[PDB]
Symmetry: D2
Subunit: 257 residues, 4 copies
Amino acid sequence: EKFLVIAGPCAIESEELLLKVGEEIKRLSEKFKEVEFVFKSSFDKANRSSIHSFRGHGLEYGVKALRKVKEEFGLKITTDIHESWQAEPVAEVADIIQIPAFLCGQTDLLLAAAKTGRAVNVKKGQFLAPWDTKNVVEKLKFGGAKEIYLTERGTTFGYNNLVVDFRSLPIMKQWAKVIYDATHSVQLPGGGMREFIFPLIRAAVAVGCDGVFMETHPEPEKALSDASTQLPLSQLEGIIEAILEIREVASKYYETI
Amino acid sequence: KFLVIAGPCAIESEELLLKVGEEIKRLSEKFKEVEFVFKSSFDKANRSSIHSFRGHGLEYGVKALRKVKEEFGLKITTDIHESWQAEPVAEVADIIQIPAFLCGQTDLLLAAAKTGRAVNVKKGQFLAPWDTKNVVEKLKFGGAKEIYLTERGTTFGYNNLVVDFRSLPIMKQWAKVIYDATHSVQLPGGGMREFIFPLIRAAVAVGCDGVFMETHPEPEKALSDASTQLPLSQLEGIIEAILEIREVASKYYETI
Amino acid sequence: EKFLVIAGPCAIESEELLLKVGEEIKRLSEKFKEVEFVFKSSFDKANRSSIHSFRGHGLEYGVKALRKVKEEFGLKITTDIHESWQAEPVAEVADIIQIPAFLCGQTDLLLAAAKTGRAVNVKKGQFLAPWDTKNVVEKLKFGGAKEIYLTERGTTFGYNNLVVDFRSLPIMKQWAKVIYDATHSVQLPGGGMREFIFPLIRAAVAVGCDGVFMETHPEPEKALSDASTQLPLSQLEGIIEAILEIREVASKYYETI
Amino acid sequence: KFLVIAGPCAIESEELLLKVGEEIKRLSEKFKEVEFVFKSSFDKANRSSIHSFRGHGLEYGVKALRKVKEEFGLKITTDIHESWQAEPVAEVADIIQIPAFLCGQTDLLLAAAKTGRAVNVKKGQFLAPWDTKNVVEKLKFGGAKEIYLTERGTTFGYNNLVVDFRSLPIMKQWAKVIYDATHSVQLPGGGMREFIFPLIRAAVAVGCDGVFMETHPEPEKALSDASTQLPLSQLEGIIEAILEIREVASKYYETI
Ligand SMILES: O=C[C@H](O)[C@H](O)[C@H](O)COP(=O)(O)O
Ligand SMILES: O=C[C@H](O)[C@H](O)[C@H](O)COP(=O)(O)O
Ligand SMILES: O=C(O)[C@@H](CO)OP(=O)(O)O
Ligand SMILES: O=C(O)[C@@H](CO)OP(=O)(O)O
Ligand SMILES: O=C(O)[C@@H](CO)OP(=O)(O)O
Ligand SMILES: O=C(O)[C@@H](CO)OP(=O)(O)O
C-alpha cells in the first residue's frame, strides 16, 4: 500500500512560512512518488502550557493560508479542531481532520469531524491504552467516518515524560490505519528529545505502520512552538529516504492483523 | 470553611437530583461547619462507548439544577465541555467545573473565568502537580478569583490511576485543593469502591480544602459510574469521619 | 493492637552514632508505652549507586554494635541481609530480619531468613504489585516464618521517581502486617523528598497500618547515606506523637480485612 | 560482530540443552557473521511461587552447560545469584549474566568481574537508562573489560513492562547493548508472544550490538516462561530477518 507522510510546521506562524515548507514538501512528493504527502499545520494551539505563549492568527486566517498551500502546490491538507463548530469550516480545505490527543474522547468533536465526509486522524491520548482506541473508532464509524487513522504520540510515564509502547502499533492496527508521530513522542510535557526522533522513527517503520507524522520547520530554533522538537526542513528528505528503505526490508515480516 | 461537593454523577432526572439534594440539604443543616455544594453533570461528554448514556441535554440539566438550588438553597456546580456553555451554565452554577481531559483548553478556561463565577479545574491524569500553576494563571488572566484544583489520580500504566498525595501540598501553593474521592479509584477504560473511604481519610490527614464525592441512592442502578458512586446512606458517616480526622490532623498541616 | 515504630540511622556509621540514636529511642519507648520500638541500622549498604559510596564496617562489626545497643537499652533489633549465609549470624542479635526491596523475590534469601525463627520484614520491591506480595508471604510461611511484615516503600513511577499507592496498605494487609516506610518512599532513585515525609506518613496512619519505618540521624546533613531523607533525631518525638493521634481518631474507621 | 544469545530458559535436562544446542550449532554454521552464545539458567532464583520449578542445581547445571560447549563448541552464558557462585560458574561460562533484580548488588558484580570473564548485566525494571553508567563503573573497578548491558523492559504500572527504545542509544555510551526480546514482553506477576518479533525488529532498526532470545522446542511444555519462549523452529527466520534489517538500518545508527 502507499505509505503516508504527514509534515509541516507546528503552527501557521505566517502564510509565508507555509509556502516555504510547502515548496520543499512539493519537491519531495515529486521525488518520492510511492509516498502520499499531506501538509500539516495548526491554525491554533488551543492548549499551550502558559497563557503568554503563541496560539495562532485565527481560524479564518489559517484556513486561508492552508488553502493557498493546497492551491499552489496541489498537496492534501490536514489541520486539527478543538471544538465541534470548527469542523464544518475546516472541512472546506482539510482532507484529513485531526483530533488532538487530549480530546480523543470528546464524542461531539468526533461526531462533528465524522459527518463532514473528510478523513479523520485521532491522536491517541497520553492517558489511553492501545486497546481502548477501539471505541474511538466505533464512535467515528457511527458518525459516518469511512477513512480513519490513529496516531501514536506517546503515553504518560511518570511526570513530564512520555514513552512509546510500540506494542500499540499492531494493536490499534486491528481497527484503523496507524500513524507514528515522530515529533511529539519524544517531547517532555511541561529523554533529550531531538536526538531520539530519528531512532524511534526507525523503530516505528521496523515494527510496521501506515504513515509517519513529523513537524518540520526551516529554522526550529526560531519556531513559535515545539522549537526543540521540530525537525529542520533540510533533514526531511534524509529521514524519508531512510524510513522507506527500512520499511521495504522489514515489510515482508509485517504480521497480518 | 471545609468544602464538600457531592451529588449524582449524571442528571438521570430532575427527580433524582431532588432526592439526593434532600439528603444533602439535611447534612447541610447537620454540619454547619461544612460548605456543601451540589454537583451533577448535564452531559457525559466522553463516555467510552457511543452507545452509553450521555444525558437529557444542557437545557433540561440547567433546569433541574435550578430546581435544586431553589427547593433546597444549595450552591451548585456542574461541568462544561465547550466554550459556548460557560454563559448559560453560569446562570445556575456557583462553581463551573472543568473536566480533567480539558484542563489545558485555554478557550474553555477563559470562558469559565469570564462568567465571574468560581472555577474548579480537574487536574488531568497526564498532568504533573507543579504544572497546574499555569492552569491557575490562565484563569487569573481571565478574571477568575475563586479557583480550585481537584486531585483525581494520575495515569499509572494502562487502565489504572494512582493518587500521589504529594500533589496536595504542591497545588495548595497556588489554589484551594479539592480531593475527588470517587474518580481517583476508578480504572480507566483495585476493587475501586473498597478504596474510596481509605483514600479520603489519607486526603484529609495530608490536608486539603475540600472533598468531591459522587453519591447515588442506588449506585448499582446508576447510568454512569455505577461501580464508584457512593450509596447515599453512607455519605453522613464518611463526612463525620473526615471532619473528626481533619480536626486532629489540621494541627499538623504544613504552611503553604 | 500495639503500633510498631522501626527507627534508627540508615547505616551503622560508628558504634557511637548507634548509642546516640539508641538513647533517644530508649527515651521515647519509655514515654510512648503503647508503641513497640525496634532499633534499625544496616551493617552494609549492598546496593549503593556508585562504587565510591559508603558501604559499612562489615557484618562482624555491625552485629557487634547492634548487640551493644540491644544490651545497653534493652531495645529490639532489626537489620537487613543481602545473601543467604548472613541469615544465621544476623539472627543472633536481630529480632526482625529485613529483606531488601530489590531482593523481595529471592527465594533462598527468604528461606534463609525464615528458618532462623526470627520475625521477617520484606520491603516490597518498587517493581512489585501489591497483590503479588501474597506469594512472598507464602514462601516465608513455607520456610517457617510465623511473624511476617510487608513494607510499603514506593513503586516505580517513570524514571528516578517513586509514588505511594496507598491502596496497597489494605491489600497487603490481607496476608501480613503492614509497615509504612516514611523515608524511602519520598526518595528519588538516582518530589522534593524531605518536605513530603510527614504528610505521607499522616496518610499512612489515616489509611491504616501496623507500623512505620523511619531512618533518623542526629545530623542528616552529615550522614554517610540517605542524608537528604533521614529525619533529624530531634523531630522524631513530634512525628510519633502526631501519628499516634491521627491513628487514634482514624482507627474506628479502619476496615476489617 | 553481531551477538545472538539464545537457548532454553531453564536447564530442564542435559538432554534438552543438547537438542537446542544442536540447532544453535547449525545456525552458528549458517550465519558466520553472527556470534552465537548458548544461554540457560541452572536455577530460577525468583519464581513467584515456592511450588514452581527452580532447577536441578548448580553442579548439574554447570555439567550440562560444559557438555554443550564440548559437543558443539558454542560459547556459554548463565546467570549467578549470589557472590559465591561467580567462581564455579566462570569455569564454563564465557559470559556471566547478572539478573535484572540484582543489577545493583555490588558484591555480586565485583565477584563476576573477578573471574576475568565477560559480564552481561540485565537492566533492572526499576532502573533509568543513564543510571546504568554506575553499574558499568563498578564492573570496571572490579576488573571487568567486556561489559554488556541488556534492555529487558521497564516497570509500567502494575504487572506490565514497556520497552523505552531511547535506552538503547543511551546505554551504548558506556557499554555494548543487548536487547532481551523475550522478557521484554512478559507481564510480571499484551499477548506477549505476538509482540516478540515486532519489538526485535524495532531493536535492530534503532541499533543494538546483540539480541537475547529464549527458545524451546516445545514452549507449551517448558517448565519456565512457557508463554514467552520462542519455538526453536522459528529461530532461523527471525535471525535472518534481523540481519537483513540490520544491514539496511546500520547505515543510520548514530555515533555514540
Ligand atoms: O497539543 C499540543 C502539544 O501538547 C504542544 O506541542 C504543546 O503546546 C506543547 O506545550 P508548550 O506550550 O509547553 O510548548
Ligand atoms: O536499598 C537502599 C536504597 O535504595 C538506599 O537508600 C540507596 O543506597 C540509595 O542510593 P544512593 O547510593 O544513590 O544513595
Ligand atoms: O499534532 C498537534 O499539533 C496537536 C494535535 O492536533 O497536538 P497533540 O497531538 O498532542 O494533541
Ligand atoms: O467529575 C466528572 O463528572 C467529570 C468532569 O466534569 O470527570 P473527570 O473529573 O474525570 O473529568
Ligand atoms: O531499608 C533499607 O535500609 C534497605 C533494605 O534493608 O533499603 P530498601 O528497602 O530500599 O531495600
Ligand atoms: O534472563 C533470565 O533468565 C533471568 C536473569 O538471569 O531473568 P531477568 O533478566 O529478568 O533477571
